[PDB]
Amino acid sequence: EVETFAFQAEIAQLMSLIINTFYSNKEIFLRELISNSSDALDKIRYESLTDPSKLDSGKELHINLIPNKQDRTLTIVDTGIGMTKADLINNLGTIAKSGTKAFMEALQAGADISMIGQFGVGFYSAYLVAEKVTVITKHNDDEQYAWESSAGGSFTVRTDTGEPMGRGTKVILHLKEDQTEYLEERRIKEIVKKHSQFIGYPITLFVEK
Amino acid sequence: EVETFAFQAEIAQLMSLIINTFYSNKEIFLRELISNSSDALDKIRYESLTDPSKLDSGKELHINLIPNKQDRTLTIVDTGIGMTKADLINNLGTIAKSGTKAFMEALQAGADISMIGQFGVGFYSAYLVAEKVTVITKHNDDEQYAWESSAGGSFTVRTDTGEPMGRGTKVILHLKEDQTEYLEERRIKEIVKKHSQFIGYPITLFVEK
Numbered sequence: 001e002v003e004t005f006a007f008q009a010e011i012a013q014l015m016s017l018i019i020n021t022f023y024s025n026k027e028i029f030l031r032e033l034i035s036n037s038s039d040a041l042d043k044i045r046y047e048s049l050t051d052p053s054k055l056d057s058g059k060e061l062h063i064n065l066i067p068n069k070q071d072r073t074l075t076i077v078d079t080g081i082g083m084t085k086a087d088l089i090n091n092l093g094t095i096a097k098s099g100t101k102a103f104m105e106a107l108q109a110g111a112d113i114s115m116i117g118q119f120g121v122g123f124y125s126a127y128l129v130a131e132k133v134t135v136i137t138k139h140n141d142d143e144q145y146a147w148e149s150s151a152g153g154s155f156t157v158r159t160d161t162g163e164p165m166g167r168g169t170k171v172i173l174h175l176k177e178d179q180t181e182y183l184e185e186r187r188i189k190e191i192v193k194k195h196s197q198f199i200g201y202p203i204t205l206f207v208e209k
Numbered sequence: 210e211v212e213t214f215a216f217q218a219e220i221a222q223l224m225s226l227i228i229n230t231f232y233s234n235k236e237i238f239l240r241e242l243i244s245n246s247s248d249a250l251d252k253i254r255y256e257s258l259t260d261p262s263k264l265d266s267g268k269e270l271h272i273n274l275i276p277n278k279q280d281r282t283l284t285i286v287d288t289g290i291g292m293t294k295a296d297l298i299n300n301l302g303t304i305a306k307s308g309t310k311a312f313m314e315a316l317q318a319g320a321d322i323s324m325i326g327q328f329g330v331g332f333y334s335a336y337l338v339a340e341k342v343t344v345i346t347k348h349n350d351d352e353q354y355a356w357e358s359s360a361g362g363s364f365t366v367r368t369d370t371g372e373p374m375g376r377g378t379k380v381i382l383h384l385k386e387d388q389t390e391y392l393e394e395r396r397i398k399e400i401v402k403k404h405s406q407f408i409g410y411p412i413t414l415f416v417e418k
C-alpha cells in the first residue's frame with residue numbers, strides 16, 4: 001500500500017519558493033544532503049558508544065555518491081542511523097514548520113537561499129535540481145520505508161520490501177532535464193571539494209560503466 | 210561530591226592542540242557554541258512535536274549571551290534539550306574520539322582550526338579563549354549537573370543543586386587575561402553578525418550594569 005499525505009502549509013510554501021525563485025547557485029543542494037548524511041552518521045556513531053549492538057546492521061560509516069546518466073538520477077547513500085516511518089512523515093525528521101518560518105523571515109532581512117541549512121531544512125534544496133525525490137531509509141527500530149514527492153503539495157510513504165539496506169538512508173534525485181551537469185564526475189568532485197572537503201566520514205564517488 | 214575523570218587520550222590531544230597551536234582567528238569559538246545551542250534547541254523542538262509535555266520545563270527556545278567584566282566570564286545560555294550526567298561524561302554528547310582523529314588528519318591535509326565544528330568537536334574551541342570552562346546543564350530525564358575543566362587532561366562532574374535552570378545548558382567561559390575583548394558589547398555583536406547572523410532562534414546580548 002502507498003499512503004499519500006499533504007505537506008504542512010509552511011513546507012508547501014518553502015518547496016514552492018525553492019522551485020520558483022530565480023537562483024543560479026543550485027550546487028549547494030549537494031552540501032546540504034552530505035551534511036545531513038554526516039549528521040545521521042554522527043547519530044549512529046554516538047549511540048553505538050553506549051550500545052555496540054546498534055552496529056549489527058553494518059559497522060561501516062560512510063557516504064556514497066552514485067550518478068546514473070541513463071536514469072538521470074543522482075543518489076546519495078549513507079549508513080547513518082536512518083529514520084522510522086514516523087520520522088519520515090514528520091517532515092523527514094526536520095523541525096520544518098518552525099525552521100521554514102524563521103528561514104523565510106531571514107530571506108526578507110537579507111538572507112540568501114544558500115543559508116537554508118542554517119534553519120534545519122536544507123533537505124528541501126534538493127528541489128533546486130530535482131523534479132522528484134525518493135528517500136529510502138532503514139532505522140534499527142523499524143522496517144524499510146520509501147518516501148517520495150514531486151512537490152505539488154503532497155508526498156507518499158510506502159514500505160520498501162525490495163533490497164534491504166541494513167541501516168541508513170538513500171536519497172534519489174530525479175534531476176530536471178536542464179540539470180544533468182550534476183551527473184558529471186568532474187562536476188560532482190568540484191562541488192565536493194568546494195563545499196564538503198573536510199568532513200568526518202569517507203565520501204566515495206561511484207564511476208559509471 | 211565532586212567526581213574527577215580523565216579525558217580520553219584523543220580529546221586530551223585535541224585540547225592541547227587548541228591550547229598550544231598559534232592561531233589568531235580565535236573568535237570562531239562563539240559561532241561553535243552558538244551552533245551547539247541551536248542544535249540543542251532543534252532537539253527539544255523536534256521532540257516536543259510528538260510530546261508537548263517535554264516543554265513543561267519551559268516553552269521559550271532562545272540563546273542568551275552574558276558578558277561579565279568583573280568576573281571576566283562570558284556565558285552562553287540556551288533552553289535546549291540539555292544533557293544527562295552520562296551525556297556530560299561521554300565527552301559532552303560529542304563523538305569526540307572519532308571526530309578528533311578525523312579532524313587531526315584533516316589538519317595534516319590542509320584543514321584549518323576554524324573547521325573544528327565540521328568534525329563534531331567545536332565545543333573544545335572554547336579553549337582558544339578560556340582558561341577554564343563550566344557547563345551547567347539540565348535534561349528533562351535527569352538532575353542538574355555541572356561539568357568543569359581547566360584542560361590538563363581532566364574534568365570534574367558534580368550535582369548543581371543551586372538555581373535550577375528548568376531545562377537547557379549554560380556554558381561559562383573564564384577568559385584568559387589577554388582575551389577580554391570578548392566581553393565587549395561591540396565585539397560580541399560584531400562576531401554574531403559575521404558568523405551567526407541568520408539562525409533559527411533569538412539571540413539576546415545582555416548589557417552590563
Ligand SMILES: CC(C)c1cc(-c2n[nH]c(=O)n2-c2ccc3c(ccn3C)c2)c(O)cc1O
Pocket residue numbers: 033035036037038039040041043078080081082083092093094095120123135168169171
Ligand atoms: C532529511 C534528509 C532526507 C536526510 C536525512 C537523513 C537521516 N537519517 N537519519 C537521520 O536522523 N537523518 C537526518 C539527518 C539530519 C537531519 C534530519 C532532519 C534534519 N536534519 C538536519 C534527519 C540522512 O541520513 C540523509 C538525508 O538527506
Ligand SMILES: CC(C)c1cc(-c2n[nH]c(=O)n2-c2ccc3c(ccn3C)c2)c(O)cc1O
Pocket residue numbers: 242244245246247248249250252287289290291292301302303304329332344377378380
Ligand atoms: C557540547 C557543548 C557543551 C554544548 C552542548 C549543548 C547541548 N545540550 N544538549 C545537547 O544535545 N547539546 C549538544 C548540542 C550539540 C552538540 C552536542 C555534542 C556535539 N554537538 C554538535 C551536544 C548545548 O546546548 C550547548 C553546548 O555548548
Ligand SMILES: [Mg+2]
Pocket residue numbers: none
Ligand atoms: Mg550542523
